[PDB]
RNA sequence: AUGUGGAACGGGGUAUUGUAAGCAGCUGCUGAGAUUAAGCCUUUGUUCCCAAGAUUUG
RNA sequence: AAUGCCGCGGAGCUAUCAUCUGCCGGAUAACGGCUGAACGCCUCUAAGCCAGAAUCCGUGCCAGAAAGCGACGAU
RNA sequence: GCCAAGCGCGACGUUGCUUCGGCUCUUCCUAUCAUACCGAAGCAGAAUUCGGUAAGCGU
RNA sequence: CCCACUGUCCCUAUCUACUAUCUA
RNA sequence: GGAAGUCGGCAAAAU
């Protein structure tokens, strides 16, 4: 058999990979976030210069397989205050935003269509009527609670996914005093937080998610897993047309490979490219978290400058990055 | 070879936290924070 | 290097700065070390320290005392070589016996000429089985005389006997 | 970074893609895919193989000296590359129209 | 040897007859054991390009046969992926008859030489004819 | 004669190539070897720490003289651009597509006369004559096709294998129009070119080269 | 002999404890009466065999470590005999070999006797009997271990002389300046003391001259030290460097030194002899002022001739980040005219075409 | 439980195979034709469907 | 034509035949010490205190009490 | 046998002489082969030898 | 014994039918 | 790769 630290080998009790540990809080650092939620689209292979001192491929180039995760900006819909107790952390109270998008309202219902859409109705009414209760609760969190987690949901509509329920979750707000975290959450109420503001493509992060099920084996598969030290290679912007165009390559193109991502679609929003494989198949939600413990060796610290990113047809033996140059080489078709 | 729980290795990890780490990561968080 | 090279190094460079003090501290604290040792250790090594320390006290007490006066069917036992119904192993059989003279007090390895009588059994005497208390004749020309076996050859592994003289 | 041309299909071969094969004569064959690698293996002549560029070339159907770096030269080369490709595309379209006629 | 060597696809296990590429007169080389193998249960030791193993001269001159002595693999039949991403496979499995110090016993080498093997062993690169 | 060893190898000629106008050192290894080379020739001729074909065998792979240099066809486009940028404009750099890419191990060339391998291509010989501007002779050294690896050639002298005949050594010396000595370097290492590199005014030998070998090289090169 | 490479020789008591502890720790030590008689016999036999193997292995290692006097070089054998009584050492080695043979014979006899064991007590008694006999034999061979250990310490401390190569033997009157000349010529620093025979043992030092390696060997002033010096000079392809006190500042008269040289001429025959007139300021005759330290180099060169006739980027990298952590940039070391162009990157391939290869 | 809704087809993209039937004098129409979700992508294309039954729940 | 035979063959599965990743704190043993009595000296030990092993206990990772629990939304 | 603190024995010392049998597998013990750390040794360095803690991890 | 051959093995992987399973 | 498997070319493919 395998390692005894992973048994009992049973199905994960959650579709979305839940964070089990957040980086330790620091008052010296100002107020920011630590985790983000994305959707796996697939991976390609890229050619990257190797600036690895002491290595035998120093000042050379290697080919690396890199997973692409679409990460549309996340909407902060609430905040949760946690108070330390002799029996552990306890959720003291929760404050939600006044207006919640249908994407996050669909989470509370198994049948949103048959529902009367009554979620947060009186909550929105009391929010508009009197703000003294909201002020009392926020003052309660900043005075008593020691850990602050913002409720954020993903804009699943932008992703080419048939699912319309947003994966609501909590992001621990590490940095500054408790009042600073509360002020940060209130300012960011109803707004959007971007992965460009959270991660910046040169740090060492961990990816967590549920693996894909292999059926029945002599149970094997569909288990919660935590990959450590997955390096971000590029946080590409969806709007920019140079997202998949490096400086050594030009050739204006998009990260979505020609022919589309297999069983996922076309990536149009901000995407994240991580070195190596990540758990879960395509179209499954993955969670990203910062480094709990600081460890930047040369591999985790060296800068990265991509040279060429493959966008060939992953469906089948693709042999052309873009239909433009495909038509330039291939003879003119009958159509 | 020594394992990852080597007491000296933990000591050297602590020493290198304030040498090739820490400060360059704190301001790195600050930059995307003010963003 | 050549010959006593640290003796050259000690001469031209000197000794360790605190060696004399450390050796003094080690000697001074040895009494606490030994007492601690006598209580913590267990098992074979403890029993060795027990026997070694008991011996050291005995000699030390004597040295002080010397100070003041100055101021199947087979034979299962070792034997010597129808009537031979049983089987006598060749390895078990012995031909030379270490006989210690009484008056002389010297052990001499003499050949086993024969077995006089085995008090355990006449058949053992007939079979020539070397056992405790058995009388055996050995050559005494270099010193034939009889002798009684005062040991157990089956266990000691040697035919150790004392001369009947 | 050189995007090579396959021996058999004569198409563009990119890093990671295809297979590389070295002969005892120290001659190197690059294959754009397994199909073209296999097609070399039983030794089909590209010019007889219908979908190869060599067939489409010979059937009527269609710098070793280093240069010092110069920003102006690189910009001029990049600008001229698009125009050259556009001219080639127009010539190919006219050739296709002539072939159809 | 000199320098590190990357993980490589293993395709020359024990009990393998393998071509001799040097001019010493040997024709066939017989793999007996692989240097630097781990304690892996029921795993046959294997060799790859640039790896030096114990080999015996099966066909050659009488004096080089019957000696369990090192040989470096220079060509490999099984396809391997180099870290640059390209895949290489050679027609045959060629080897060079080498002393345990790492010096070419022969004076000339026939056939192409793997670039990793020329890089790993400086003497092999010195006596190599072509390294492609 | 300077004693140096790249990494833990005495075959300095494998990891580096020396000419009368420029020097090349391996990339990705230890900077000590490059510093040692720069300490003796950095202020005289340029030294480029580059690699050919992604390997540290550039010394035995690249062959050339003070006028021009040749690199194997396996050299990358970026590598060729880096070499041209580092090397002076008067130092011509040309790529050679030959069946034997080991130019340094097949051909030994001086500033005036060059000896190539017997099986060199006519196009390669024409390119060598055009670039190096030297007379190319198709011969062999000590009966071995690897003339560039078994023989060391320079402007003031040459070194060959000690097993060569006296008449053969005299014929080679007359053909090369320079003195020739049949000896060994690095304590019997028969690959003189791999074990030692000699320029017009200086020579570099491995750390394992004997005192007698160093004295013989100094007498032959008159340095 | 001079190769040393011999492990330390423990005392008799320490060796016995080491052997017994090794047998106890390695062999199993749990044998109950419930096991079969064959199992009990096998357990006792295994313990006896393991003890016999351990004793035999240690004895064999001790025997093999000591070099054979006959197989050593004549100079090495003579020095060993003069310094450590080679006859006694050979006797001790023979006694140890005989003891090892007796131990093996005793173990074989005990193993055969225990093969037909009867019960647990008989096996236990037999197992004890074999161990005690082995311990008695080990304890009996007590003084031999101490003598061997002292010889090993002396042999390890002894120099590794190389008479085969060119050598220069400096022998003569004590403190005649030959030792000072040898110390100056060679890297070795031989101690010099006012007391006679300060250099009790020979000192060998390598030197380089005219691209040749010369082994300068000093000898005690001319006793055991004198006998060792004579033995070394008797069989050694070396040039004599006898020094005579010209000023008689060494306590030996010129006539006495000449008489000693004439007497020792039989050993100096068939060799290049040098007569060093020491303390000149205070057989080839060379004047070397011992007090003024003048002419020592000339004398050494003359003796060598007679013997021959008879026969930075790295600093910047270390300061910046150190080796293996500092990324060397080749962009700076470029001959591009524009510094901005050299530091800036260019597109290698674009739109399916290699821009670098098409520009 | 009426929507960037769903499903049936269809178009386009993309892929696999290797130039289709048929016509004319091996060549041309023909890298055409066929297949393409059955666990590929996309759809201002066409048609159809749904604003329900039963159960349980303070 | 029971999948007659042959070549290629997506998709899927799969391969140390392909690729990624594999963590930090203290407390100790052996042992080395500091202060320091017992015992007017001394002493790593008695009260005390450091340094110190791949050991130990945590962190991290997996499971979540299906009779442990909190906050929140609607009614 | 000689002593022999002592209580005729008499310890430590001293004299002699010489059917079973083995593959896989699971864990477990340490009486530790390797890995980690210490102590000692004429232990210069390197390579060792002996002895401790030590079953985490292999064998 | 030599040569050839092969999933016996390194080291297993994939496909097909039947079985196996559930329903009346 | 080619019997390295197993006490062993047992079964397959080769012919």
From Swiss-Prot, chain A:
Keyword Transit peptide: no
Disordered as annotated region, ranges: 1-24
Residue spans crossing the bilayer: none
InterPro entries assigned to the protein according to its UniProt record, in alphabetical order: L3_arc_euk, Ribosomal_L3_dom_3_arc_sf, Ribosomal_uL3, Ribosomal_uL3_CS, Transl_B-barrel_sf
Entry-annotated residues carrying Phosphothreonine: 322
A single GO molecular function term of this UniProt record: structural constituent of ribosome
Modification sites for Phosphoserine: 3, 55, 130, 133, 197, 245, 305
Keyword set, alphabetical order: Cytoplasm, Phosphoprotein, Ribonucleoprotein, Ribosomal protein
UniProt cross-references to Pfam families, sorted A to Z: Ribosomal_L3
SUPFAM superfamilies with a match to the protein in the record: Translation proteins
Compartments in which it is found: Cytoplasm
Keyword Cytoplasm in annotation: yes
Predominant subcellular localization, coarse grouping: cytoplasm
Gene Ontology CC entries for this record: cytosol; cytosolic large ribosomal subunit; preribosome
Gene Ontology BP terms: cytoplasmic translation; translation
Assembly description: Component of the large ribosomal subunit (LSU). Mature yeast ribosomes consist of a small (40S) and a large (60S) subunit. The 40S small subunit contains 1 molecule of ribosomal RNA (18S rRNA) and at least 33 different proteins. The large 60S subunit contains 3 rRNA molecules (25S, 5.8S and 5S rRNA) and at least 46 different proteins. uL3 forms together with ES39L one of the contact sites for the signal recognition particle that targets ribosomes to the endoplasmic reticulum membrane.
Note: There are 2 genes for uL3 in S.pombe.
Family: Belongs to the universal ribosomal protein uL3 family.
Name by which UniProt lists this protein: Large ribosomal subunit protein uL3A
Species of provenance: Schizosaccharomyces pombe (strain 972 / ATCC 24843) (Fission yeast)
Record lineage: Eukaryota, Fungi, Dikarya, Ascomycota, Taphrinomycotina
Curated annotation (Swiss-Prot), chain D:
Keyword annotations of the record: Cytoplasm, Nucleus, Ribosome biogenesis
Gene Ontology molecular-function annotations: structural constituent of ribosome
Gene name of the record: rlp24
GO cellular-component term (any): cytoplasm
Regions that span the bilayer: none
Top-level division of the source organism's lineage: Eukaryota
Compartments it resides in: Cytoplasm; Nucleus
Protein name: Ribosome biogenesis protein rlp24
Subunit-structure text: Associated with nucleolar and cytoplasmic pre-60S particles. At the end of biogenesis it dissociates from cytoplasmic pre-60S particles and is likely to be exchanged for its ribosomal homolog, rpl24.
Cited function: Involved in the biogenesis of the 60S ribosomal subunit. Ensures the docking of nog1 to pre-60S particles. Activates and recruits ATPase afg2 to cytoplasmic pre-60S ribosomal particles.
Family from the record: Belongs to the eukaryotic ribosomal protein eL24 family.
One BP annotation, GO: ribosomal large subunit biogenesis
Swiss-Prot record, chain E:
Keywords: Cytoplasm, Nucleus, Ribonucleoprotein, Ribosomal protein
Any GO CC annotation of this UniProt entry: cytosolic large ribosomal subunit
Any one of the GO BP annotations: cytoplasmic translation
UniProt subcellular location: Cytoplasm; Nucleus
Disulfide bond entries: none
SMART domains per record: Ribosomal_L14
Any one GO molecular function term: large ribosomal subunit rRNA binding
Note, other: There are 2 genes for uL14 in S.pombe.
Family stated for the protein in its record: Belongs to the universal ribosomal protein uL14 family.
Function as written in the Swiss-Prot or TrEMBL entry: Component of the ribosome, a large ribonucleoprotein complex responsible for the synthesis of proteins in the cell. The small ribosomal subunit (SSU) binds messenger RNAs (mRNAs) and translates the encoded message by selecting cognate aminoacyl-transfer RNA (tRNA) molecules. The large subunit (LSU) contains the ribosomal catalytic site termed the peptidyl transferase center (PTC), which catalyzes the formation of peptide bonds, thereby polymerizing the amino acids delivered by tRNAs into a polypeptide chain.
Subunit structure and binding partners: Component of the large ribosomal subunit (LSU). Mature yeast ribosomes consist of a small (40S) and a large (60S) subunit. The 40S small subunit contains 1 molecule of ribosomal RNA (18S rRNA) and at least 33 different proteins. The large 60S subunit contains 3 rRNA molecules (25S, 5.8S and 5S rRNA) and at least 46 different proteins.
Protein name stated in the entry: Large ribosomal subunit protein uL14A
The encoding gene: rpl2301
UniProtKB/Swiss-Prot annotation, chain G:
Keyword Nucleotide-binding recorded: yes
Domain OBG-type G: 166-308
Transmembrane parts of this sequence: none
GO CC, alphabetical: mitotic spindle; nucleolus; preribosome
Main location: nucleus
Family: Belongs to the TRAFAC class OBG-HflX-like GTPase superfamily. OBG GTPase family. NOG subfamily.
Protein name, entry field: Probable nucleolar GTP-binding protein 1
């Amino acid at each position: 058999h395998g390692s005894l630290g992973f048994l009992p080998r049973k199905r994960a009790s959650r579709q979305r990979g839940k964070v089990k540990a957040f980086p330790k809080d620091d008052a010296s650092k100002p107020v920011h976030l630590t985790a983000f939620l994305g959707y796996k689209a697939g991976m390609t292979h890229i050619v990257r210069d190797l600036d690895r001192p002491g290595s035998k491929m120093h000042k050379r180039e290697i080919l690396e397989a890199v997973t692409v995760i679409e990460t549309p900006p996340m909407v902060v819909v609430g905040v949760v205050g946690y108070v330390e107790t002799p029996r552990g952390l306890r959720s003291l109270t929760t404050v939600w935003a006044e207006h919640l998008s249908e994407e996050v309202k669909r989470r509370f219902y198994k049948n949103w269509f048959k529902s009367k859409k009554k979620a947060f109705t009186k909550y929105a009414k009391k929010y508009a009527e009197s703000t003294q209760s909201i002020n009392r609760e926020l003052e309660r969190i900043k005075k008593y609670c020691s850990v602050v987690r913002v409720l954020a949901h993903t804009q699943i509509r932008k992703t080419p996914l048939a699912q319309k329920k947003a994966h609501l979750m909590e992001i621990q707000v590490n940095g500054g005093s408790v009042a600073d975290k509360v002020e940060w959450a209130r300012e960011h109420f109803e707004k959007t937080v971007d992965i460009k503001s959270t991660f910046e493509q040169n740090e060492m992060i961990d990816v967590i998610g549920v693996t894909r099920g292999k059926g029945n084996e002599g149970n094997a598969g569909y288990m919660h897993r935590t990959q450590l030290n997955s390096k971000i290679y590029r946080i590409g912007a969806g709007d920019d047309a140079k997202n998949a165009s490096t400086d050594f390559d030009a050739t204006e193109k998009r990260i979505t490979p020609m022919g589309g991502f297999v069983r996922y679609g076309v990536v149009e929003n901000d995407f994240v490219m991580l070195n190596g494989a990540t758990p879960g198949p395509v179209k499954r939600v993955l969670t990203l978290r910062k480094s709990l413990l600081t460890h930047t060796s040369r591999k985790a610290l060296e800068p990265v400058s991509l040279k060429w990113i493959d966008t060939a047809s992953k469906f089948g033996h693709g042999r052309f990055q873009t239909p433009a140059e495909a038509k330039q080489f291939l003879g003119t078709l009958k159509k | 070879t020594s394992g990852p729980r080597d007491n000296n290795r933990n000591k050297w990890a602590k020493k290198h936290l304030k040498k090739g780490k820490r400060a360059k990561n704190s301001n790195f968080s600050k930059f995307l924070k003010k963003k | 290097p050549q010959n006593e090279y640290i003796e050259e190094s000690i001469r031209k460079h000197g000794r360790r700065f605190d060696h004399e003090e450390r050796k003094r501290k080690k000697a001074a604290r040895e009494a606490h070390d030994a007492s601690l040792y006598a209580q913590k250790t267990r098992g074979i090594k403890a029993k060795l320290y027990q026997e070694k320390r008991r011996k050291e006290k005995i000699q030390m007490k004597k040295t002080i005392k010397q100070h003041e006066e100055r101021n199947k069917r087979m034979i299962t036992k070792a034997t010597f070589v129808k009537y031979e119904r049983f089987i006598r192993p060749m390895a078990l059989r012995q031909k030379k016996a270490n006989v210690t003279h009484k008056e002389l007090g010297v052990t001499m390895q003499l050949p086993i000429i024969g077995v006089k009588k085995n008090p355990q059994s006449p058949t053992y005497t007939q079979l020539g089985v070397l056992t405790k208390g058995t009388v055996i004749e050995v050559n005494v020309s270099e010193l034939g005389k009889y002798a009684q076996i005062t040991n157990n050859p089956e266990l000691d592994g040697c035919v150790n006997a004392l001369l009947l003289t | 970074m050189r995007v090579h041309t396959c021996y058999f299909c004569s198409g563009p071969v990119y890093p990671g893609h295809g297979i590389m094969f070295v002969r005892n004569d120290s001659k190197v064959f690059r294959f754009c895919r397994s199909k073209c690698h296999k097609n070399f293996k039983m030794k089909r002549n590209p010019r007889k193989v219908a979908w190869t560029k060599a067939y489409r070339k010979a059937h009527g159907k269609e710098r070793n000296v280093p240069v010092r770096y110069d920003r102006n030269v690189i910009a001029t080369t990049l600008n001229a590359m698009k125009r050259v490709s556009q001219v080639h595309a127009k010539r190919e379209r006219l050739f296709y129209k002539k072939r159809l006629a | 040897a000199s320098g590190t060597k990357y993980r490589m696809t293993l395709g020359l296990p024990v009990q393998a007859i393998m071509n001799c590429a040097d001019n010493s007169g040997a024709k066939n080389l017989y793999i007996v054991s692989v240097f630097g193998t781990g304690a892996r249960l029921n795993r046959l030791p294997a060799a790859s390009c640039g790896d030096m193993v114990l080999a015996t001269v099966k066909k050659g001159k009488p004096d080089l046969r019957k000696k369990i002595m090192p040989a470096i693999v220079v060509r490999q039949r099984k396809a391997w992926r180099r870290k640059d991403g390209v895949y290489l496979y050679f027609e045959d499995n060629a080897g060079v008859i080498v002393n345990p110090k790492g010096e070419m016993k022969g004076s000339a080498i026939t056939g192409p030489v793997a670039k990793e093997c020329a890089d790993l062993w400086p003497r092999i690169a010195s006596n190599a004819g072509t390294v492609v | 004669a300077l004693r140096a060893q790249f990494e833990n190898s005495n075959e300095i000629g494998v990891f580096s190539n020396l000419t009368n106008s420029y020097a090349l050192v391996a990339l990705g290894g230890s900077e000590n070897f490059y510093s040692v080379f720069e300490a003796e020739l950095g202020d005289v001729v340029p030294v480029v720490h580059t690699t050919i074909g992604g390997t540290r065998i550039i010394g035995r792979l690249t062959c050339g003289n003070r006028k021009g240099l040749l690199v194997p066809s396996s050299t990358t486009d970026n590598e060729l651009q880096h070499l041209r940028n580092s090397l002076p404009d008067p130092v011509k750099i040309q790529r050679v597509d030959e069946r034997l890419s080991a130019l340094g191990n097949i051909v030994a060339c001086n500033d005036y006369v060059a000896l190539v391998h017997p099986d060199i291509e006519r196009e390669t010989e024409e390119i060598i004559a055009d670039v190096l501007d030297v007379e190319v002779f198709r011969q062999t050294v000590a009966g071995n096709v690897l003339t560039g690896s078994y023989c060391a050639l320079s402007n003031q002298g040459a070194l060959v294998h000690p097993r060569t005949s006296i008449q053969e050594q005299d014929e080679l010396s007359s053909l090369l129009q320079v003195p020739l000595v049949a000896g060994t370097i690095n304590r019997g290492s028969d690959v003189i070119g791999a074990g030692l590199v000699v320029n017009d005014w200086c020579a570099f030998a491995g750390l394992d080269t004997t005192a007698t070998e160093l004295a013989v090289c100094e007498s032959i090169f008159k340095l | 002999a001079v190769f040393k490479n011999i492990t330390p020789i423990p005392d008799v008591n320490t060796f016995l404890d080491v052997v017994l502890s090794r047998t106890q720790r390695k062999t199993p030590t749990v044998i109950r009466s419930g096991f079969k008689i064959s199992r009990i016999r096998g357990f006792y036999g295994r313990k006896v065999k393991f003890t016999q193997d351990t004793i035999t292995e240690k004895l064999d290692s001790i025997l093999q470590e000591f070099p054979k006097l006959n197989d050593i070089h004549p100079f090495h054998a003579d020095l060993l005999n003069i310094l450590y009584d080679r006859d006694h050492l050979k006797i001790a080695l023979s006694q140890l070999s005989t003891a090892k043979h007796l131990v093996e014979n005793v173990a074989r006899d005990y193993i055969r006797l225990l093969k037909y064991g009867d019960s647990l007590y008989r096996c236990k008694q037999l197992k004890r009997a074999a161990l005690g006999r082995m311990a008695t034999i080990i304890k009996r061979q007590k003084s031999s271990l101490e003598f061997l250990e002292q010889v090993r310490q002396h042999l390890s401390r002894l120099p590794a002389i190389d008479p085969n190569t060119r050598t220069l033997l400096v022998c003569g009157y004590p403190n005649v300046g030959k030792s000072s000349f040898m110390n100056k010529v060679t890297r070795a620093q031989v101690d010099v003391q006012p007391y006679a025979f300060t250099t009790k043992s020979l000192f060998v030092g390598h030197f380089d001259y005219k691209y040749l390696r010369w082994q300068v060997i000093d000898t005690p002033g001319i006793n055991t030290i004198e006998m060792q010096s004579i033995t070394a000079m008797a069989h050694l392809r070396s040039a004599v460097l006898y020094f005579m006190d010209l000023s008689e500042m060494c306590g030996y008269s010129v006539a006495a030194q000449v008489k000693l040289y004439h007497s020792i001429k039989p050993l100096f025959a068939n060799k290049v002899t040098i007569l060093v007139l020491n303390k000149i300021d205070a057989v080839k005759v060379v004047q070397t002022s011992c007090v003024q330290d003048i002419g020592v180099m000339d004398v050494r060169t003359t003796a060598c001739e007679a013997l021959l006739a008879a026969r930075l980027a790295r600093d910047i990298e270390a300061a910046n980040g150190g080796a293996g952590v500092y990324n060397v940039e080749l962009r700076d070391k470029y001959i591009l005219q524009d510094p901005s162009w050299k530091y800036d990157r260019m597109p290698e391939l674009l739109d399916g075409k290699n821009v670098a290869d098409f520009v």
